[PDB]
Amino acid sequence: GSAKDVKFGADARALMLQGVDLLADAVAVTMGPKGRTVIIEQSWGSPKVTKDGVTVAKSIDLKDKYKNIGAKLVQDVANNTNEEAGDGTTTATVLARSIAKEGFEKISKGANPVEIRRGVMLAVDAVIAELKKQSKPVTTPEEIAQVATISANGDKEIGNIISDAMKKVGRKGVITVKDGKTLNDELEIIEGMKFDRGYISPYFINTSKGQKCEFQDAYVLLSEKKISSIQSIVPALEIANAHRKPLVIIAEDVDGEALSTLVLNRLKVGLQVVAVKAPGFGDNRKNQLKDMAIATGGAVFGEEGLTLNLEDVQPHDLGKVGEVIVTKDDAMLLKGKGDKAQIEKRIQEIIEQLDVTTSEYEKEKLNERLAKLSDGVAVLKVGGTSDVEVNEKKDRVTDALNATRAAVEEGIVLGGGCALLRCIPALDSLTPANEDQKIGIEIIKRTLKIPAMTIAKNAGVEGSLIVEKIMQSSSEVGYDAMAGDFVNMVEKGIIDPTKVVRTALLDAAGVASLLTTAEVVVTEIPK
Amino acid sequence: GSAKDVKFGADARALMLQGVDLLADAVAVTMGPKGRTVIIEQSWGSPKVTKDGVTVAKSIDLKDKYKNIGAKLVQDVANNTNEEAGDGTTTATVLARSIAKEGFEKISKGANPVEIRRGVMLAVDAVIAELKKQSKPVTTPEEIAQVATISANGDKEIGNIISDAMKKVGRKGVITVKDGKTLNDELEIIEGMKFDRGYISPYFINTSKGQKCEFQDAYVLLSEKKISSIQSIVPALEIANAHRKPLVIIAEDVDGEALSTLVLNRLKVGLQVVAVKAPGFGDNRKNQLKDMAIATGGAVFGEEGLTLNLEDVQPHDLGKVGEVIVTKDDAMLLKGKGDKAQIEKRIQEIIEQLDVTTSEYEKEKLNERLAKLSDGVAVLKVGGTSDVEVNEKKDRVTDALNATRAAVEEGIVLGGGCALLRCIPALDSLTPANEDQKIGIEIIKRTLKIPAMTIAKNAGVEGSLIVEKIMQSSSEVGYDAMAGDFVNMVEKGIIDPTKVVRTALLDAAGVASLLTTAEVVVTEIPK
Amino acid sequence: GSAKDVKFGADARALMLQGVDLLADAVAVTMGPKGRTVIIEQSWGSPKVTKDGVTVAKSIDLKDKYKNIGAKLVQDVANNTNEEAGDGTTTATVLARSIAKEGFEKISKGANPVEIRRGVMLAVDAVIAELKKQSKPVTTPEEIAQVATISANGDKEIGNIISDAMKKVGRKGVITVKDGKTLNDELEIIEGMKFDRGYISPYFINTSKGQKCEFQDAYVLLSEKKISSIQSIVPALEIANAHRKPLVIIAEDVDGEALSTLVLNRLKVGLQVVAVKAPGFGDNRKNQLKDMAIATGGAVFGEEGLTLNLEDVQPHDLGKVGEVIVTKDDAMLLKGKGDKAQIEKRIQEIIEQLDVTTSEYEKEKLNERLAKLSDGVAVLKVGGTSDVEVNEKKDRVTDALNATRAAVEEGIVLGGGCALLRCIPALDSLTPANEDQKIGIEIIKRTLKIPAMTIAKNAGVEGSLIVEKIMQSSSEVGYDAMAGDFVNMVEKGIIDPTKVVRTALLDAAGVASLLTTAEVVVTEIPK
Ligand SMILES: Nc1ncnc2c1ncn2[C@@H]1O[C@H](COP(=O)(O)OP(=O)(O)OP(=O)(O)O)[C@@H](O)[C@H]1O
Ligand SMILES: Nc1ncnc2c1ncn2[C@@H]1O[C@H](COP(=O)(O)OP(=O)(O)OP(=O)(O)O)[C@@H](O)[C@H]1O
Ligand SMILES: Nc1ncnc2c1ncn2[C@@H]1O[C@H](COP(=O)(O)OP(=O)(O)OP(=O)(O)O)[C@@H](O)[C@H]1O
Ligand SMILES: [K+]
Ligand SMILES: [K+]
Ligand SMILES: [K+]
Ligand SMILES: [Mg+2]
Ligand SMILES: [Mg+2]
Ligand SMILES: [Mg+2]
Question: Which residue in chain C is spatially nearest to A74 when comparing CA positions?
Fold first, then answer.
């Protein structure tokens, strides 16, 4: 459709590499504990100061349309490493740059770049198998704290709060990072069923100190449909008044007649009653109301599947809770007097629904519901003086959470780039099929030294001598870039998730080996 | 999305500092009692002439996109100091510039800027602890006048007019700065319940001198809903006529039939009656009408929670006031004959609602309601010849009010930048963990002299000699920039709020230490 | 309409060839097993890395409007070869460039380019007849795997799964290439009737493990129109309950009364019943419902042609299936207890409708229906680390599928360009009518060596010496570009489809011989 510019051979490959080396030099400065931080100008407001590889990579676009192709491919590498792993984007960026450079240097007239790519993938599969061979499972919370500390730029107070959250809500539990209005971070553990729905009317308040609505051992009434008529709410009030028990009515809404009855009974005779909207808008609303009915111990009125009417209310069919807190912004239920067998059956139903869904938005909803039935959720509030500090620390806390989850799921290997340095003996025992696959095997063999070299280079010391001292040392001795000496990496706590390393290596290698098969580059003419 | 320009190392850090030094030189000229004033061009009309640090900072944007990043970060420093404290924005600006300069000068190949930042925050926490150690509470109104005088550029009349307002309406009372049409400032104390609602009909006037509607010992009828029918207003008029007491009807509105009845009864037989609209539009109208219900001694008719009907009106159901003044623009109620216990209970309810809200717009409403139930509010009308004078003086009056509130809340330390000069012995007793945290501790140690140096530099004298004479003097002796000698600064009245100093230092240090961790700057290409 | 630029003679033919040689040099680098790969800039997102001839050709447009004509004509050559054959676009591109060059070189004052074109088409018809003479039918699945391996750039793991898919679903069966979320490719064979329609209500689930709705030996009720009334669904439930058989109701939709009846019966008494929407929107919905009626063994109710009512349902009118699985996204029917004679009659009807349609969108629908009634369909999921890998491999899998189908339809000749090299003895036995047709015969004779020369040139060796060794060898000996030696092409497995070769040659030759009749070129003036 538009006029094109076509470039051939090494005149193009030298240009695309110029886009890689420009984008992978702004990322490699953020690697390791001694790496520095990149400021990106934001158009709407204040600049974004970040140490994240995928945030630096995604913000670099080049005016030259031949360098922009290499920039976009390394952006793809970093973005894929962020998507599948959540950490190790800088390592993937520098590995992709190294593979691109080594593959561009090795292209000759008789060379076959496709067989070089095949050798690269064969060597990478061998390295991934060796990484899975040398992994160890996480068995103690000390290793959890060590992983979260290493992944958060050596911040011990972030590892110690993520480890506490995983100890409280479970290792496979819901932990959410949130903005904080204080100077220091904090951890909030939410137990029971708390939903962001307030009371319908402010006259239900019986606690003057916190402006809350609090009862003990309260009856629970639930409904899918809106409650409007007098006859649909009076019999539940008769069960509440006869047994002398408080009532909380969770519904879609309570309309004018039912509201008038509830507030008039609350203010005049002294009946204890509160009305709360139900959380959700669609099928999640139905699922949360059914979860509430299972946890409380009663049946939920007005379901579409089964004919249940609010006109006939029985005492066994109303739920029971030991504690209910309803405020203006949220409502909270604890100690539901349900049956544990049905709660476990609902947990199994949610787990089996989780195992078959892939929408990435339903999964969060069923995880939240499962955590509400389980020990609860955790909220890490990140504190700082300004929004820039909060965003910078929130990036590191999110990276630490993702790396802690990846270490839970798969395992831990040595950190500091020393995991890939012990997979070079695995590459030295490979027999290439032809001379072209040997080139790819040597490319991958020379690439495994790059992360440790970059970590040592950002620390100011010479990367090559440090790496050569690492390989000549024992299998447990590695360089500590913060302290500057050679230590036992497991004992000192420098460990990495296996999933992060084997994701970064593969996602770098595939895209870079596909890039190094290029001869002709077609771009648009700059209008 | 757009083409980017990427800069590396000291070629970028020298540019961003050029945006800091440009922004923090236009602010540092306004520091101290001998500081000068900055004129900013306004596009719509007359230029804005101001001495406020945050107003000068927020008005500076630079065409170079590398200098604009440093400009935006110092803007963030000034804006955060203005939000959290309301004063000390120039001090935060100059502290941020000094920390940025000292951190940029100390970056080498082997240096770790993250550990330098950690040392900076460690030193800042030590200085903040020392500042809280040496603070004194405000115990006399003389110190209140001294704080408001120092914060208003040495204006003794502003300090006196704020000390008098705090003596009249209370230290934690509502004081509002307003435009004045005279040459001199004035203070207006509004007692009782005054709301900006006039009478419905001009025929209710019984005072010819001021065109006001005034009664003594009047009945009060309050209506939630609009009054339209004859039967909803006649029985209240029967209670008013039988007891021979004036009646004021505060409602949403008075419609045609009730209005015709009221004006016809007022003009024909001589019944004393006035109708006023209710202040507010939503829930604030409900809360204000309830406040008048408790304050007057009656119950508000037509409430949604409890069925109250205007058709049956009892003499105990009507409030009583000792004084009512209704004009065209406002209505005024004093000496309500309510019960003091219920008034105190309503005050406690408003206070407990204040302690749990964070919307920053509801807080003003509950503060206004609490002050209406309390001694009252104060209005400082700022006088001047032109609008530029009123705006320039209003900035200083607002700064004095914010600093007086901050001195009430936390305490007072020595002014003139001498509060931070006595925290250098606190820094000299710190043991840094490594060589990189020692750099940050020395950066903060060299930064604590900067406010006193800037104050002395704006006075024309040499800052370094003055600071060295301050540090070699006693703990109470400091420089007086207005008079030019070394005086006992507590006895002379040069004091500062502790909250302002410890806010400016922290908000400068966090953002500037985050800025000094930069190596790569990514900006947009100027199209 | 617009101002035109007119060029005459060799000043124009030298320009248009400059557009051919620019477009056919970016394609010829992708030829053979040692050919390289072209990166094309995409405006919206990541660049497209590809080896396809027609994708490289269609993405090249030139700013010069005289070169763009030759570029557009070679684009037409590649696009026609892609439409008619699906493979061999690079061969057609290089043959078109060679014919254009040889015809442009031979134009003189006395030459007749129209008779040169006539000689070109005469020689091409002779070569096509010789190619059809030397073809062999595909008789073993080993040749199928060899063809799919050669067409997929020597990937044995693609040819193996394509051969397995053709062995499972039949050689003339539906095979669909799809995106994969894994690292490796996979093959999914779908048997029976599977349609992408879920259940109406989630309460029909009776399998907790997979959240599926599964029965065995179930009755099937099929409805053309929507089911809403009570009386239209009750008698079918009576047949289901009396015989104690599960029921699946495939309809347009099930409305509120019927849904309430179905879920209430499913939850209360325990009747096994599921409601599924019908697949399709128009006549395809009718045809699919009729096919399900024939396969299951019942009659579809509510058809427009014949008056069938849901109020009277007989046990013989309901279909029977041995296994039904209904999930949220799809339904599955297997082992329909229909009559084989009517199923074969429906298969014959679908085949006879296929033989008379040419819309290219109905053909896919009847092929899908025929495969659903036949062994089933196959889905090849292409795996990769990133989207670029998946697209690059999907192009080769799509090429291998099309070449395998073309080898099924017509036959196989020698690969590596050795098919056209054995048709030059066929050209040496032609007697030209005049001197101008002899020029075209010699042009085609010199063009038949071009594919083998290009394959040998991309391998780094000299094309002319390799070709001259090929024609001096036996009829079965050809160059293996991957291994670099002269081998028996049939025994080593280097074979090509006859249809692909005879399509590429003809589509190149016609358009290039029409191009070589040019004397005057009229273009638009570049505004
Ligand atoms: N004290 C340390 N000594 C040596 N190596 C360390 C130390 N702390 C961390 N590392 C190593 O530094 C690397 C962490 O680098 P960094 O976190 O900056 O980037 P990343 O994980 O590749 O990507 P992302 O920017 O997405 O976090 C890991 O290889 C880790 O093992
Ligand atoms: N007579 C004085 N002698 C010495 N120092 C003084 C005197 N009066 C005020 N100061 C000091 O000068 C500073 C006041 O500066 P200024 O009010 O211009 O700026 P600020 O408070 O930092 O910010 P803002 O511009 O927002 O008001 C305080 O440190 C105060 O203690
Ligand atoms: N190992 C081999 N040795 C020799 N020739 C080979 C070998 N493998 C394939 N070929 C030949 O290379 C050609 C395949 O080229 P290629 O697949 O790149 O292009 P194409 O089929 O013309 O078009 P498209 O780009 O659409 O796939 C065929 O002529 C095939 O016979
Ligand atoms: K990083
Ligand atoms: K100032
Ligand atoms: K090709
Ligand atoms: Mg990390
Ligand atoms: Mg001030
Ligand atoms: Mg092909």
Answer: C46
